[PDB]
Design a protein around this nucleic acid. Sequence first.
DNA 1: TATAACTTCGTATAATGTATGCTATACGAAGTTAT
DNA 2: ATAACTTCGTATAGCATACATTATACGAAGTTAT
DNA 3: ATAACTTCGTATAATGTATGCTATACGAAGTTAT
DNA 4: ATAACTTCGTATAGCATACATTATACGAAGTTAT
Lengths: 322, 322, 322, 322
Amino acid sequence: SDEVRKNLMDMFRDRQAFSEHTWKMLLSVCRSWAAWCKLNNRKWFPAEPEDVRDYLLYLQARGLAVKTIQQHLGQLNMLHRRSGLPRPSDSNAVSLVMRRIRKENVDAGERAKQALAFERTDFDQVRSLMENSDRCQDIRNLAFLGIAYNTLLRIAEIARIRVKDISRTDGGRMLIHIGRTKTLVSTAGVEKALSLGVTKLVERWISVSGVADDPNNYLFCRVRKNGVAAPSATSQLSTRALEGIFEATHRLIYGAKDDSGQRYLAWSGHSARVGAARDMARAGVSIPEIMQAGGWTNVNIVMNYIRNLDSETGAMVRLLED
Amino acid sequence: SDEVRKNLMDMFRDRQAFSEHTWKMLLSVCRSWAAWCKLNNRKWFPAEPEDVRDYLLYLQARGLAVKTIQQHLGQLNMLHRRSGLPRPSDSNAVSLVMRRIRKENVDAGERAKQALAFERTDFDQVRSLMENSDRCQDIRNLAFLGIAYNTLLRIAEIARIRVKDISRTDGGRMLIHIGRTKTLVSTAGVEKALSLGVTKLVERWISVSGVADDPNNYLFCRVRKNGVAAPSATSQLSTRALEGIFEATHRLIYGAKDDSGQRYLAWSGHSARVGAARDMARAGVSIPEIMQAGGWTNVNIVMNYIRNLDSETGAMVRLLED
Amino acid sequence: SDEVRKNLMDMFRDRQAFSEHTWKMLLSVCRSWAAWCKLNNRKWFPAEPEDVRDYLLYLQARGLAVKTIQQHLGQLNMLHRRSGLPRPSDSNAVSLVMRRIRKENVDAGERAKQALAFERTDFDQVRSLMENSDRCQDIRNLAFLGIAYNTLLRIAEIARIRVKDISRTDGGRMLIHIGRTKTLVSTAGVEKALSLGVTKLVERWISVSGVADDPNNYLFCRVRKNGVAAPSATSQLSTRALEGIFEATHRLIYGAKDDSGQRYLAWSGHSARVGAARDMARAGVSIPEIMQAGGWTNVNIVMNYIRNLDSETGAMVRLLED
Amino acid sequence: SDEVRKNLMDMFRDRQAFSEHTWKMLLSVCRSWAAWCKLNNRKWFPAEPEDVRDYLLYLQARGLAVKTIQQHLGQLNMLHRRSGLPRPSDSNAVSLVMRRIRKENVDAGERAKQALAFERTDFDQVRSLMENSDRCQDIRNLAFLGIAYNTLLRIAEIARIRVKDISRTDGGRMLIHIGRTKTLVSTAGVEKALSLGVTKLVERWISVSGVADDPNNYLFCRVRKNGVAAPSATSQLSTRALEGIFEATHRLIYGAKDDSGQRYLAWSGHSARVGAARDMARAGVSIPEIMQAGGWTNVNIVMNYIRNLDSETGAMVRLLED
DNA sequence: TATAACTTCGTATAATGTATGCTATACGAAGTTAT
DNA sequence: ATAACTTCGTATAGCATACATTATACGAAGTTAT
DNA sequence: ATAACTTCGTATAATGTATGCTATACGAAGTTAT
DNA sequence: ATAACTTCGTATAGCATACATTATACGAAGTTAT
């Protein structure tokens, strides 16, 4: 108990050991679990196997995804392991229900989702509609879509790009140095080159926005109702705003969302990563090259994006079709 | 003892964590073992090593297969291990007798049997005979055989396909989503692509049966004697019936089975999985593609499948006849 | 001590859990280990980590191969695990010393060996050289070499073939049913077909020997100095005699071996298995088909046989030469 | 405490179970750690979690690489684990600080670097420049570059090749037997095949060096200023000198290195390995074939190797521009 | 009024991926047996 | 005197089996909309 | 003396296996400069 | 009075890291046969 107290003090002292996103999820899960425990007269810490099991059944009955349930369990595991206590996962009761819950939800037809693809056909279409808008907002947004599709960078990585990360190649293209990599060994590399077409789009945004007046300015910034951009070296466009661009672009072409509350009814942050992976597959680019283009180390993530493409139909279709 | 009862209770409480088939065989083996124990004045639980040893030798003396005897031992091991007790196989008497029985039976001529292959040449012949039929039953059966051969799915997996699990590639080939196999349980699941010609077979079945009136209908259903399909979202076509389709199709080409009482005299549920594996092997399909096709993650299983490749038409005879 | 005794008595009682070749090696290792222990004033049972370590270093200094050393350790491990005692391998000392031994022997240039290949060119040469012989011996020996090369059966498997295992195909070829498979799931299949040419070699042997006079007769039998064959249904030709055939055949062509004492200076029991794999690989037979042909489940055994063939030289050679 | 000294003595006694480099670095880190402890009034062994925590923060403050700090922690961990003591990383204070340091450094822009690629285009250019030289040094150096690119072997593995390790395919291509790499120690080892071109470069070196006078000579040896090679069976050409060949070859083509003190301004020992991996990936060589070429057993390392594929000529730019 | 076309069920046996270990051949030498 | 084995012990190469499931095989008997 | 190494120390990257954090999604509430 | 954000919390998709080694990177100092 003094041991657990000490262990948790260590966690606070070195809290930068974990992402702020990890902490947010931990806190969210602990609130959920503690609220459920107070309601059901259970002790929330240390978590007992039988109680954790009932809670997971609750999450299932609520309609949460299997991955959501795993997250809740994962956070409980982490809190306990770092406290020096036995993990909920290491119990018979919890291993058994998780097995049961996964099988039941799979058989009930639960599907993992993924971003609606934003592909070359969509990019050309948006390009042909918005190319000659000289509204600042439209100019920024097109440059952003170009970079997203061209580089397969995640929204948080795009939001962090500074003017000084960009140089010019011998061949006329912009080259974006990756200032902060995703991991120590950067599978996606240290640089992303833009095509000559996307280079033009970004050049347009830079000259229109004034961001290059200070090399430390983030590439992308706020554009207010009066078509004036507000460059900043201290404040990034939020990843939320970047998702808004994808959604607005989709609304431009396809109108209002279907309202069914479902996810991925419009393009989102991951849409151009999915779309690019698909276009490379269509063109016959090797799996390893596709994986490097997006900084993937696992084939299965990529497979999920491209597995409904005719080029990926497998040997039996090939055998049967001659 | 209270622990034992609690462990067993918890297993039964989350019984859906296990296959129906696992439970069915547990109960089947327990009955056999309990009946033998009553007759031989032994205690059925907890099971004593010397008694289990006598029981396994009794099973060998009954002329049962090695894989049958291992099933009985395996179910006994699971009952004990999941009670939190030592397995019968944790003792020398039982683990040595099991090895001894396997060795003696193999030395005496025993080998595991395999389903008769249903290969491309059989699928093509059946299609040439049946494709012109207007009978609902023939249209169903041909679509089923097409899916079985094209996908290599177990008959239980095919029986679970619902109309909503079907999508299309950009080239218009059918894609089947499968979330649960014997080895995979996942909300990401797998996509099984159908050739253009098998897609057409399934399209014909769909139009004639009316299964797509509800996306929750199982793709396959019973077809009564008046030729009318009876679609259902609650009732699968039994795997016994799917075995029946293979058997009836074998009869169509080859007439009645011989008298011997051996298994695998006609095509059965495993036939097109083995046939497709053999065809891929003979075509020189790469091992990764073979494994992708059958959904295997380990390479030793490919050898299980192709173990009975025809020797007379095989490599060495062909090399020598030079 | 009562528990060790009981455990060992269980082992005696179910002797047949292990191959006789396994017992012979356990007994051999125990002699060697116990004699070294007596010499060095050590207790041989239970074996202690420090003593096992010193013994392993003795084996190394003797010049025994790494596989041989592993064998002595594995037999020691077996005896202790089945006695219910801690295994020599589970100690820091023995674990550390095996790593050191492997590394030192490998750096000293110790190489694992394999049978001298008996390939199609050798088989053709032998047939050409011997086909005018009318001696029962030579006729038997040619039929043996033909079966060995054509079927890739191991010598013990060949020694066990009975006359009743042989049937005729509609093509005129002999088909040898495998009476006793290597394992329960026979990756080599249940049958080996002979080419028309090897069928003829075998037909000649059957007619000069008289073996077919009783269907339970082993196919191969001894032939005494008067050129008279002695068929038997109860006595096999020894696997040692079958190795003698390969050796004598090599000696005919190449003369007497070096007196160096090295292994594989002439053909031996595994030579035609090695040769046939190489001939299939030269002919472009796929690796899975080569494996099925010899009943191999692990690729790397086969790869050791064919690794020096130009077809197996890899991607870098292909890139460079193109 | 006696247990601890025994455990440590056992490790030292079987020194040879570990790489000489593991020992070198254990000693390097212990010196650094013990020197810091002396200056900071801490006890060096057994290490206190709080003291190790301070030391790691001290390394971070010095501007050392994340992988450097991991190495120090790693050697301290191994010293304690192999003593039979808890590792520093078994405490939160150490395991959390290590995560924190990694995350902070990466967030500040740190990423692991990679050798500059020595690819086919570089090999062809060097070969064009150097082919005609009759200096023993250049002949040696070109044979070395050829082997390094063709085989992807580590420089230490190339330095260990003895003349006796070389055989021939039927088509006359050299094959190099390698028994030991960073991940494999085997008396079966691997055979690394050379192209006909690279075979010729090696033959030329063998002819002019006289290394083949003794099969035990290492293939590569020093060449003194009078252009005469000094073959040896006991002394390897150093890996330092092999790095110097890459460095001098780079300088030949690009001139002298920057004075910036950064690593990988010129080719180094890992360059042909990364270069060959990239060439295979761009050529569309199958993953299993890339794995076979580099002697890798796991797929994630391919991604480590190809992480810095050139973006400007990469798949996305090509897709967008054509 | 029967029957096609199922479904249910029992015992019997095969198929999966991961983890760990026996089981065969090699061969010089000695022993055997019918010429 | 000897060919042509068999038996033996140990050295070393080559595969092998357990485990904990989850599945199919198939005859037979029971069911339900024609 | 010098080419062409070798030795040595610390600094940092590369492997295969086992396990776990870390990002995006998005409706809604809150903020700010037009 | 509002466009166009930012902040927030929870749901869910996507990757991520530790471990226990074994390797290379490279400046600089020391070495030997010319």
